[PDB]
Design a protein around this nucleic acid. Structure first.
Lengths: 211, 217, 211, 217
DNA sequence: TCAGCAGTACTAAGTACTGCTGA
DNA sequence: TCAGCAGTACTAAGTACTGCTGA
């Protein structure tokens, strides 16, 4: 698990967790064995990033990861009253969500040696922030039943993270400190707001709880 | 977990578990055109019509350890050993493999840009290729492409969807038993279409099929 | 580590430790993957055993594994006064040790395609106890400098150990309970006594400390 | 850790670390006929006579991943590529491998019973076979047999012991430097005797040598 | 300094997450 | 029951034990 201080502490040596270090190779993120291969010391270090599938709530109660960040920052004045207003007014005007895009199987007129060829289109929402972080919203078929489930990711470059790991392997159970910018937390909220009405309704009544 | 492969009464038979919903073999139910997972141990199968929408989806593999002693190759070997798959069957399967020049892997995976935005968030569409074929006996065979997670490139995977009416015993109107597996007699034509599926999935898959088929002949 | 209760608690899922489960195969003990292969339910379970390279002292002070067993059993009257006397009188009469046998390289008159062929002989002391346990004393070249180091092993059959693991895989961090017979503890002491004068001198003054 | 293998001035050169006493490459000192480990970073090498008793013992391997791009095969390949190991050298090495009919592995490992007891404890003698050869250039090559720990059977391992006088720089009268590695020019005759050592160690080792030598020729 | 790596080779743990099994 | 396995696929941890490295 990641501990939240505002600041968070993310482990580097758990590629099977929701927090995993990846490296851009041939355009796709691939898992990195941070303990058998030394991190590059040059410009390639920008191609490395931590992928954190961030969650909003736990136990149906609002104090885990993102929800803990946001309210810690209101209690510290980091988020003004009007931050939460315009976050909610933004939610009040949001009609469509990535869930509304859904997952479709489009039929092509192609036949591969007797096999009919189709295409599955998956909708993805992506936003880049000036400091280098990326926010990803992906759609997946609900494993429990009919419908969709939306999931939010935060991609943090290893250059935005200290101690700098250039020219060495990771430490055992290494946990590294990342200062959380203010507008990442609010763009993360907006990410949940535009993911699904289910996510927005929970973000909406969480912001109302402290405003 | 692995499914039992056996020969009985001149038929290749596989025993498919129906109580491991998290495995390569899982019982599903089509609801509005999407296969939904089924908790076969708490909700009872319907005894009425629309039991057809229930099926077994089997993510079948051909190779293991660079060897051909696993699932499909186990079935094909037994079928060859028992005269179920004849010399002419395998010879012409190899001729079909020689003629195949394009593969499902050639379609690739692309991320399309869109004219759409969602409240300041850029919208992309990742399209994935799938190959589907319906057999007259009721089964479906699907080939989906995906990114090779550890390397770069693609890996293709073959699925066979078996309707519950094609397996025994009849599960109509009851909950699956503890550790229950169903008896599925594999038609000869399905084994051919499954071998062909691996042939057109990717060149790497085809040369595995060709090497196994030629070693048996 | 193994906890001592007299009774000890030995972990089953650490093949790289001093405590490892082995199975006799082709006459030699081979490591067992107690989590990927199910233990046999039949007579083959007798071929499985726990190999524990037992230590006598730690921190140069006498209260670790064997030394903790022995004095716990004197304090409980499990070892009489004359047990420790005849253990020491046995030590007082012991002249030779397995270390005195040493490791030799004997030369054969054979030549394998221009290569001279020799034989290294390693001395081993072995004793079987009626309940099935084995005690092994092996000699190894001292890794630190000139000389030898002696090491004592206890081989415990899986049939002498509960819960019975027939027909299943081990539990995670599984620790299993073994009741320690009285004469195993004293034959273990005698094992250290006949291993080397260095080991005997420490056993000797340990027994004198509580007698 | 792995030793650097390179070609320079018509000589195959390996760079051997002398500050990793726990590795496959470790500095030893013979005291009364036994190689004792040396702490090369706290006790200084002698500048006087009896520095010969100090040597580097290298547990050298030929294969890795079923491939021949590791240590000895790296050296032999470079030697072949640079005319250091000629066509006639490799051809007659293969003829030596064809004639070899017995191996060090054939001697086996036995536990002998003894007429001795040690105060109620049974005494056994486990004997292990070792093959040794001294080269005129000063190096020794040893083949020791051991039980294959994970399987059953034996695995043989080749050692090459290099006296410190055969490497540069001269370490007489000083403590090894931090992360220091020494330059060792590999004589052609040693590479042959090391290839022959693997040939007579076991049949499995020989067929690895024969396959690599024939692929190079 | 002096905590922690270097080196070695292999299994078992961590990992996410529900049904489901078992005693 | 209800704690913990079943199933899945991969790296990183545990392991013993000293020299030795590094910041």
């Amino acid at each position: 698990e990641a501990s939240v201080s505002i600041v968070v502490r993310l482990p580097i040596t758990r590629p099977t967790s929701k927090i995993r270090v990846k490296k851009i190779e041939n355009g796709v993120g691939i898992p990195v064995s941070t303990r058998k291969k030394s991190f590059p010391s040059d410009e390639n270090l920008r191609d490395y990033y931590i992928e954190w599938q961030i969650s909003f709530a736990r136990d149906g109660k609002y104090d885990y990861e993102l929800s803990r960040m946001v309210r810690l920052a209101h209690e510290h004045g980091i988020l003004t009253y009007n931050d939460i207003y315009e976050l909610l007014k933004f939610a009040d005007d949001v009609k469509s969500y990535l869930e509304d895009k859904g997952i479709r199987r489009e039929s092509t007129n192609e036949e591969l040696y007797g096999f009919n060829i189709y295409e599955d289109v998956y909708p993805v929402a992506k936003k880049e922030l000036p400091s280098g972080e990326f926010i990803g919203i992906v759609l997946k078929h609900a494993q429990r039943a009919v419908g969709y489930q939306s999931m939010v990711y935060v991609c943090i470059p290893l250059t935005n993270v200290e101690p700098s790991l250039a020219g060495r392997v990771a430490r055992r159970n290494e946990v590294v400190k990342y200062e959380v910018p203010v507008d990442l937390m609010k763009e993360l909220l907006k990410a949940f707001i535009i993911a699904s009405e289910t996510h927005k309704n929970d973000i909406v009544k969480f912001l109302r709880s402290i405003i």
